[PDB]
Amino acid sequence: EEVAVLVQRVVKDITNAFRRNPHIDEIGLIPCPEARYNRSPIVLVENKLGVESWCVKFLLPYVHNKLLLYRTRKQWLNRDELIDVTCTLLLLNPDFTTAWNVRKELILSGTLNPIKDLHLGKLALTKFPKSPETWIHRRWVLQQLIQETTIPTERAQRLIQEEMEVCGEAAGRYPSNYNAWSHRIWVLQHLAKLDVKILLDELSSTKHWASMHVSDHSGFHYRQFLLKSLISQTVSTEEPRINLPHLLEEEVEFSTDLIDSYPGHETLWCHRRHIFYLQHHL
């Protein structure tokens, strides 16, 4: 029908939307029953990218089927075309593993720049902040940025801090976002190598976040992880030794100060309960 050209126009509208505006915060769905005359469903307001709902029922299966044809070698696509379709495909359904795998091959072949995928996933995590495959792909991309060939490099800390931001924002959009906090932990293990400095900075900054999300056991587990990792590293940067029993008593105080303020939340109960385990085993 006319859908063949109405949709193929959109995949360029989205691609051109990124060239026009590099600083796009989030993507979103705009409630729209039917198409507006000669108006693209791709609406760019401020730093926000909107997609009118009427086109989604047409846009997705077009791009979806196009990638599968490429994967099965039923239809050839330019590497520029391949990037464009996978991009619009993953903004609609980031759980589509194969599309991510295709981009992996592009990155590994040298066609695609790894940073472009980080920013892509970052946008996808605004509409789908809990999408498992997105976090999975992120780990592969990050792992490729270390295999390029002690405190990690300056560029590494730039990436790590970037991971702390997206894991935090994704934790704010969905309550008890397991996959988000699990990724944040994974970063500190492989990207930061349990750096004593970063562990402390993470412990300090997230203390306020925990007070504003008391029912988020995933966030409080991150607290437990930070503390548990500090014990492993300590067996200036030598002060956490005397501070180790002090941080644990500060944490149990901070938790008690929340249970007395906000009773009922079993997370706070479970958190303190877990902190007790740390103090008893030293």
């Binding site: 089927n65 994967r71 759980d95 593993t97 592969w140 397991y178 932990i185 997370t267």
Partner: protein, 329 residues
């Protein structure tokens, strides 16, 4: 403020609608919706498995097109031996397990190159005994389970480094007794199912503190009767499988509150359409429909076939293949 939990209404279902559930799964996908198909095709193979198993548990597997599915599965096998979620998609250990599970239900594992499947799974194990989802190296305890679950149904458990595989899973056990996706992860009822299922297959349940872990699992039950996966999470019917199956494996199922949980599961039915939602009054789907039925079967629902807590399949099916792991007495 009250605890975060659902409130079961009086007009909510309290009777097992076994027939309407069979009709729901049977008429699923009948509507020509291209959008919904594409959206969920990335896990379609697992979707088939959920659909067929819940029908077999109700003894209505015959209502499903055996031949059409068996063709689909044979098309989803690749050169590397792995099975993808659907035709065209990339192979993955998840849908490799789902495919084998389906072929086992239909007693036709020969439709697929069994030897290649074993090779694919074996080539996913790392040096530390962990398992990856595919060739891209994503590590998860789910994959450790999917590996041995696939091989056990093929009678090829000794193909992989069993001793080293067990070594890794035990390194994912947290102090609370639970398991995560990776070492140092937050305990998750779903991840616990995989690990307890793993250790059941590899015969290492003696490495599990049944009292401690069973305690953690029983803490998932809320005043409504429903179960969740983690502390302060809304009750979910799918977790009435992940939690119960773990309990049955470690031998602590009797600790749970039978009737209250049963009334929760039944309350998540749809009197009009059929199938189970995650909570009473929500949209239903084949996923929650299976684990709702499977949960009731574990609780002792006599209208439903006894389900194996490890492989999530009818016991009679796993009796034929001589694969029934010894559980904790």
């Amino acid at each position: 403020t009250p605890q975060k939990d659902v409130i079961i209404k009086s007009d909510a279902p309290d009777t097992l609608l076994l027939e309407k559930h069979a009709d729901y799964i049977a008429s699923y996908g009948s509507k020509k919706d291209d959008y919904e198909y594409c959206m969920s095709e990335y896990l379609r193979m697992s979707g088939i498995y959920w659909g067929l198993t819940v029908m077999d548990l109700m003894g209505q597997l015959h209502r499903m097109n055996r031949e059409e599915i068996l063709a689909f599965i044979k098309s989803c096998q690749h050169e590397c031996g792995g099975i993808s979620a659907s035709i065209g998609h990339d192979p993955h250990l998840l849908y490799t397990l789902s495919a084998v599970q389906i072929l086992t239900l239909y007693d036709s594992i020969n439709v697929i190159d069994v030897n290649k499947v074993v090779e694919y799974v074996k080539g996913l194990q790392k040096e530390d005994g962990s398992f990856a989802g595919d060739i891209w190296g994503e590590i998860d305890t789910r994959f450790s389970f999917c590996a041995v679950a696939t091989l056990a149904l093929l009678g090829k458990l000794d193909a992989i480094n069993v001793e080293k595989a067990i070594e890794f899973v035990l390194s994912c056990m947290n102090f609370d007794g639970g398991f995560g996706c990776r070492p140092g992860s937050e305990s998750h009822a779903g991840q616990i199912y995989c690990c307890t299922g793993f250790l059941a297959i590899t015969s290492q349940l003696h490495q599990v503190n049944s009292d401690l872990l069973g305690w953690w699992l029983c803490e998932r039950q809320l005043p409504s009767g429903g179960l969740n996966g983690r502390p302060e999470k809304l009750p979910d019917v799918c977790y009435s499988w992940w939690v119960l199956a773990s309990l049955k494996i470690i031998g602590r199922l009797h600790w749970i509150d039978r009737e209250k949980l049963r009334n929760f599961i039944l309350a998540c039915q749809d009197e009009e359409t059929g199938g189970f939602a995650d909570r009473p009054g929500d949209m239903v789907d084949p996923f929650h429909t299976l684990f709702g039925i499977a949960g009731l079967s574990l609780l002792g629902e006599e209208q439903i076939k006894p389900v194996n807590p490890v492989f999530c399949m009818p016991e009679e099916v796993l009796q034929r293949v001589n694969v029934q792991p010894e559980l904790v007495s």
